[PDB]
Amino acid sequence: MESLTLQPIARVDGTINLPGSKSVSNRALLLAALAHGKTVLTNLLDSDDVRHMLNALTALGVSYTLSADRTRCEIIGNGGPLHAEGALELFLGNAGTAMRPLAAALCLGSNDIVLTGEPRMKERPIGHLVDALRLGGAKITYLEQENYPPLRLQGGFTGGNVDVDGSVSSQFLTALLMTAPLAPEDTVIRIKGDLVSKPYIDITLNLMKTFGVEIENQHYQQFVVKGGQSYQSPGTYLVEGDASSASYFLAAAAIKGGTVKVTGIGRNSMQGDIRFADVLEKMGATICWGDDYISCTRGELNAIDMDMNHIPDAAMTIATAALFAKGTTTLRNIYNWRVKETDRLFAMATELRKVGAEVEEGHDYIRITPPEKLNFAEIATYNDHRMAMCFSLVALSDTPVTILDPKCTAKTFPDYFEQLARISQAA
Numbered sequence: 001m002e003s004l005t006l007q008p009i010a011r012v013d014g015t016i017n018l019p020g021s022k023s024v025s026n027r028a029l030l031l032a033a034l035a036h037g038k039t040v041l042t043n044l045l046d047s048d049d050v051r052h053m054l055n056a057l058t059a060l061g062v063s064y065t066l067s068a069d070r071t072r073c074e075i076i077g078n079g080g081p082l083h084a085e086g087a088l089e090l091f092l093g094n095a096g097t098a099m100r101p102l103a104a105a106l107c108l109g110s111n112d113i114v115l116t117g118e119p120r121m122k123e124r125p126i127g128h129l130v131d132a133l134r135l136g137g138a139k140i141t142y143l144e145q146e147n148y149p150p151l152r153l154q155g156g157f158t159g160g161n162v163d164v165d166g167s168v169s170s171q172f173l174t175a176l177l178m179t180a181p182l183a184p185e186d187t188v189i190r191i192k193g194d195l196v197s198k199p200y201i202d203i204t205l206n207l208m209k210t211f212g213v214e215i216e217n218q219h220y221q222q223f224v225v226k227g228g229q230s231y232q233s234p235g236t237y238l239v240e241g242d243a244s245s246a247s248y249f250l251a252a253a254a255i256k257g258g259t260v261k262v263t264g265i266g267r268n269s270m271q272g273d274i275r276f277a278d279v280l281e282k283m284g285a286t287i288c289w290g291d292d293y294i295s296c297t298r299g300e301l302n303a304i305d306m307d308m309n310h311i312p313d314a315a316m317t318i319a320t321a322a323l324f325a326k327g328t329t330t331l332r333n334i335y336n337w338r339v340k341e342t343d344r345l346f347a348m349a350t351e352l353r354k355v356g357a358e359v360e361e362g363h364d365y366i367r368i369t370p371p372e373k374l375n376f377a378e379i380a381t382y383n384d385h386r387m388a389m390c391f392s393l394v395a396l397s398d399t400p401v402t403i404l405d406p407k408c409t410a411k412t413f414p415d416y417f418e419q420l421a422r423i424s425q426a427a
């Protein structure tokens with residue numbers, strides 16, 4: 001087992017040029033592949049999630065070229081639905097933002113392809129999306145456990161009246177939204193009940209409009225999509241820096257700054273995780289908003305009790321930042337923490353307790369009572385990039401912390417530790 005030990009960081013201060021948004025990157029890649037024309041993505045994220053998406057596009061016959069730092073990508077649009085026959089296997093590694101969207105997109109036409117990935121991918125639910133796709137005409141077969149990948153897609157999604165459960169993941173709706181415009185018939189996507197991670201739907205809609213497609217959003221309860229559309233290359237597209245990745249650095253400043261400025265995202269960003277800054281502000285930190293930056297300056301840190309359903313990922317960062325806040329922090333309505341890279345509620349509670357916190361792992365919430373002082377712990381990361389990044393913040397104290405499998409950050413942020421070190425100051 002590989003590990004990285006972070007020595008206590010006395011102060012953080014500096015500027016970080018954010019890696020590209022993983023959410024935006026994979027949506028842009030898929031739309032670029034389906035679109036007509038050449039799309040040039042800039043500030044594209046170079047991480048495992050994107051590499052796996054790129055690998056899948058290659059397997060699907062899409063042509064593209066990458067710059068040296070793999071942040072600039074020129075994609076030759078397919079000019080319509082990707083075609084894949086022969087019941088071949090499409091390996092998506094561990095990119096859920098590839099698996100979900102492609103599961104839907106490859107249901108267009110008369111394909112026959114099997115989607116799978118690393119063993120862990122088979123543990124992320126996709127049943128709600130399959131249910132919706134089938135209502136739209138798609139022929140889908142679970143090759144292993146019902147409601148999970150691998151899936152054998154045999155086309156048939158034509159559109160029509162489609163219900164979709166949006167209570168476990170916004171990604172199923174996202175996948176349906178990107179695929180539907182290309183279906184031959186108009187589609188009416190009806191959300192069964194609650195819709196979690198709503199901000200991600202806005203990212204999806206934003207990307208779709210950029211690629212030439214708009215739909216009718218009826219208060220996020222139903223989405224009317226006209227079929228027979230085509231995605232069009234927007235020419236050059238700038239990928240916003242990753243707001244989720246930015247949370248770690250902004251939190252670092254709220255805890256041990258100094259002022260940390262992240263560039264690549266600003267007040268105009270489409271990502272819901274920029275709202276993470278509001279939480280730090282509510283906790284006592286100072287936030288500065290720029291056109292292409294967000295900065296956080298140390299103030300004080302006070303515990304908060306909030307519904308974090310709008311920023312599920314960035315919320316994990318608040319969970320460890322809570323170790324440094326005064327009082328008990330409660331993060332509510334984060335049930336789907338349980339169905340991601342690992343069960344994050346279980347994982348976060350387990351590791352937080354290891355560094356000294358008293359933690360109540362609620363079914364869909366977490367209450368964190370910080371200790372008077374943190375203690376050393378060899379943090380288990382559960383093959384989850386965010387566990388590694390969240391716990392790196394434990395080093396912003398008097399105790400060092402050992403992070404197991406530090407390379408797991410590569411899913412979305414390969415250079416995480418060097419970047420953290422960049423803003424880590426001894427004086």
Ligand SMILES: C[C@](O[C@@H]1CC(C(=O)O)=C[C@@H](OP(=O)(O)O)[C@H]1O)(C(=O)O)P(=O)(O)O
Binds near residue numbers: 023097196313336
């Ligand atoms: C889970 C994860 O990131 C997810 C990416 C995502 C998207 O549409 O881009 C929506 C969210 O999922 P949900 O809350 O709607 O299910 C994020 O949590 C991803 O791609 O795995 P990450 O947190 O591991 O980066």
